[PDB]
């Protein structure tokens, strides 16, 4: 059966400024089937209060979701998105680069 790998982008809602509140987003898109595991990490550890958008899909039937959490960026804290899906042999971790 059809399986399509998720594309992953990890980014903030607003340009990041240390000490100013924001949202950290992990957008997963282009994937099939819809079962997917998405965690947001702060310094390696799973963030607990993470919400997501309602499942929807593109013209080619592939799904997309936005996972998101409130955060206040600092100079030292590192953020990442960690994704597992049937198309990925191991969880894929994408680091937040305050520039992508």
């Amino acid at each position: 059966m059809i399986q399509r790998t998720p594309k992953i982008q990890v980014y903030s809602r607003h340009p990041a400024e240390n000490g100013k509140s924001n949202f950290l987003n992990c957008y997963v898109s282009g994937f099939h089937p819809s079962d997917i595991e998405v965690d947001l990490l702060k310094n390696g550890e799973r963030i607990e209060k993470v919400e997501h958008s309602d499942l929807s899909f593109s013209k080619d039937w592939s799904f997309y979701l936005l996972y998101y959490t409130e955060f206040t960026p600092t100079e030292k804290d590192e953020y990442a998105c960690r994704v597992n899906h049937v198309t990925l042999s191991q969880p894929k971790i994408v680091k937040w680069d305050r520039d992508m």
Partner: protein
């Protein structure tokens, strides 16, 4: 300008873990306005835009009644399709349905759609004439013939040309501030040095609505399609969208490169340069 309304439905079977998961969402243009999730506690259709929150209980009760009925037909569909493709009872499968309508810039009916997919592949679609069906699979022919005999296309054409566009026009008027708006992209560039002999120039468009945008790089006015890295347009989470495009610029050549931005919210297309 032109506008659309779309409803998207996904049902996923969970053999041995109870009833299939059913999720419905509705959009006007690029703005979600309603959702239903079978696993959620309310069991109601719920608002997801501020302009639909004032519709009132007849709207909410009737949309809840209809969306639950869509969930039950998909539940039956998963069993029907398993039968058609001779699949076992053990595996999880996915049915998706989309329907809705487009209006042109005169707000008159332009096009309607009604289509299904099974396990990620086209299953059956209503053609543009709203009278006939495209089915690729041998299994989908059974469905096509059933729908021809029951005159499903006639029923859908009535809805797509009448009800669908009339409610789109209602939504557009009631949500005029949210839906008839454009947010122009706020733009900037970043410059990061790969090595000593070249650097990455990235052109950003942020906080725009609707999602449709063209970001391109030129070098001496020549398009650099092959050599531009583009990311998919992505939601900011607040109802606006973001995108970037990057090129690799050899040393001393920044002034050769222009980033071009087209968007309905701009009074004029932008030409940006690192300088």
């Amino acid at each position: 300008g032109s506008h659309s309304m779309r409803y998207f439905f996904t049902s996923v079977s969970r053999p041995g873990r109870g009833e299939p998961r059913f999720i419905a969402v509705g959009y006007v243009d690029d703005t979600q306005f309603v959702r239903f999730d079978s696993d959620a506690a309310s069991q109601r259709m719920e608002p997801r835009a501020p302009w639909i929150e004032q519709e009132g209980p007849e709207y909410w009760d009737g949309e809840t009644r209809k969306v639950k009925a869509h969930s039950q037909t998909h539940r039956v569909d998963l069993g029907t399709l398993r039968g058609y493709y001779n699949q076992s009872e053990a595996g999880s499968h996915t049915v998706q349905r989309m329907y809705g309508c487009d209006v042109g810039s005169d707000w008159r009916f332009l096009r309607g759609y009604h289509q299904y997919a099974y396990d990620g592949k086209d299953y059956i679609a209503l053609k543009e004439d709203l009278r006939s069906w495209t089915a690729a699979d041998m299994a989908a022919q059974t469905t096509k013939h059933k729908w021809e005999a029951a005159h499903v296309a006639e029923q859908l054409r009535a809805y797509l040309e009448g009800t669908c566009v009339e409610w789109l026009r209602r939504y557009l008027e009631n949500g005029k501030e949210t839906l008839q708006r454009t947010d122009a992209p706020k733009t900037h560039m970043t410059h990061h040095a790969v090595s000593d002999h070249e650097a990455t120039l990235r052109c950003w468009a942020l906080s725009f609505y609707p999602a449709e945008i063209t970001l391109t790089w030129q070098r001496d006015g020549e398009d650099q399609t092959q050599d531009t890295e583009l990311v998919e347009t992505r939601p900011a989470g607040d109802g606006t969208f973001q995108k970037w495009a990057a090129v690799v610029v050899p040393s001393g050549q920044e002034q050769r490169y222009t980033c071009h931005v087209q968007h309905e919210g701009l009074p004029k297309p932008l030409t940006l340069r690192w300088e």
